[PDB]
Point group: C2
Chain length 320, copies 2
């Protein structure tokens, strides 16, 4: 395959914001949507690999991240804004459809993209976060609070400023510890006013899949932006719930290949594995192919199991 | 076949209590009224369609009549409104419905068709055609630029102001319902054959209870709706549609609308649009003013399905 230097970088105005797009290759578009707290850069291995197989790999920094515009208001980060961006981006590519690959928050954008404009998506490779049907009886954050308590990370992510302070008080080290984390189960912070267990321990050494140059690149971007843009996605969960009422009991009709590590925080959170194995996932996503569970892999599977992920993507999309 | 034979009930949909009026048995024909109307605006179609073997269902929309009116302006975005109607359809226990709508109800209807087309067999749309999202400019910003600050929708924006202005609510409704003036309704600052004082009194009784705030709140979300519906820029409606308008309708006579229809642009965005029906000498409230013809127009279309 190629080098990082052969990847093209550019800016496009989409849905009223300037978006950074990285891309390489010619052929059918494969569009990659990163998660939190990541960047287009999280897809580096897949960009090289898929372009080498005759596809046009496209990976933007999402709204609020990296070199993409970060609107000042929290309310500009609802699911409607996010999918709007990606729809505008797809239309800017001059193609009728794309193959879609996404991870974490990017996969949530990807699910609603598949619901809102399915004709734009030929097939979807979804990493980490499966479809989550809307629960009209309770708001999502409320439910998390009732199930995991006030210290569940997403609950603590809600108040403006706090999670930012909790982390940054060295963004390189903060990104590194987030990326190298392998603790399964729901992330439950200590009570407010108590130190994160992290700060008492030395920074853990890098795993094989993540280099210092990688950590340096991540840090260069987040040193400028901070985490606010990314955190604002979580801050719109309850509003998103109001805004998506029309998709209660909706089904995704795009073909999907779902892939997760078995140590993924998401997979090992209450309900998710049961949701998958009970057949509920398949009910909601009738053209879901056989689910892939990656032995001994944690949350950041596009990076940790980069080669296997590039392979799984190609083997799926070449079918269409 | 008698107003009193029409069933009334309350159903919990999308977190609000919704008053629902219905008659007949058979395939559902769901009716969505506009501003400043009620379930009552479909009275003649309800009787007519039930008399033809369909189950006619007509709610008061969010903010109207006997339906709950949430207090927060932000509870009236297009996402809430379609949310309500999707939940309503789900509560009926049938798979698909025939949809008929008018004015703001037609706008709800259009986005319903975009959001959940699988729930709509066919759509009979009155007065308001599909409007493709304009990414260059927000809708109220565009109205102010085109028509200035006294354009009615611009005046509706500031909370309380229109309410105070319209503050005898039945006379107010009477003047809106009988209006036939042409062109951009700009604000300052006898009854037609088809409308009776009886009808006026019903409307006046409900709006004396509710006020106009609920319905005006739909307009106060036009700009936010625009921000929230960017994912549907260039989207196409995949439901069969019959569009019907009176030729004196302010929408039909407004800038670019007749062109949108005649150029074939409407047909481009709604590829299964049938023959547009233009009713001569009919103004905005074509469901009431041409009750019989509208009823027959609905019957003849939905029987094809």
């Amino acid at each position: 395959r190629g080098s990082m230097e052969e990847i093209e970088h550019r800016t496009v105005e989409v849905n009223g914001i300037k978006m950074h797009v990285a891309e390489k290759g010619e052929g059918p578009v494969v569009l990659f949507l990163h998660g939190f707290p990541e960047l287009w850069y999280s897809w580096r291995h897949q960009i090289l690999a898929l372009s080498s197989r005759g596809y046009r790999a496209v990976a933007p920094d999402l709204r609020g991240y990296g070199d993409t515009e970060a609107p000042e208001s929290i309310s500009s980060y609802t699911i409607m804004h996010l999918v709007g961006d990606i729809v505008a981006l797809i239309d800017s590519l001059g193609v009728g459809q794309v193959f879609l690959v996404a991870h974490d928050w990017g996969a949530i954008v990807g699910w609603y993209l598949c619901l809102f404009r399915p004709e734009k998506i030929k097939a979807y490779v979804c990493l980490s976060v499966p479809f989550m049907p809307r629960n009209p009886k309770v708001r999502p954050v409320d439910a998390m609070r009732a199930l995991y308590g006030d210290d569940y990370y997403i609950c603590r992510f809600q108040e403006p400023g706090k999670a930012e302070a909790l982390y940054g008080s060295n963004i390189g080290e903060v990104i590194k510890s987030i990326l190298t984390n392998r603790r399964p189960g729901p992330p439950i912070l200590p009570k407010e006013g108590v130190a994160l267990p992290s700060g008492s321990l030395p920074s853990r050494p890098l795993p094989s899949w993540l280099s210092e140059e990688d950590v340096t690149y991540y840090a260069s971007k987040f040193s400028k932006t901070g985490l606010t843009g990314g955190l604002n996605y979580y801050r719109n969960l309850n509003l998103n719930w109001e805004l998506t009422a029309a998709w209660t009991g909706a089904k995704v009709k795009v073909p999907v290949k779902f892939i997760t590590g078995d140590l993924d925080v998401v997979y090992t959170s209450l309900g998710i594995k049961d949701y998958i194995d009970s057949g509920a996932f398949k009910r909601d996503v009738p053209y879901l192919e056989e689910v892939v569970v990656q032995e001994g892999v944690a949350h950041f599977n596009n990076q940790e199991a980069a080669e296997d992920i590039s392979n799984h993507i190609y083997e799926f999309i070449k079918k269409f």
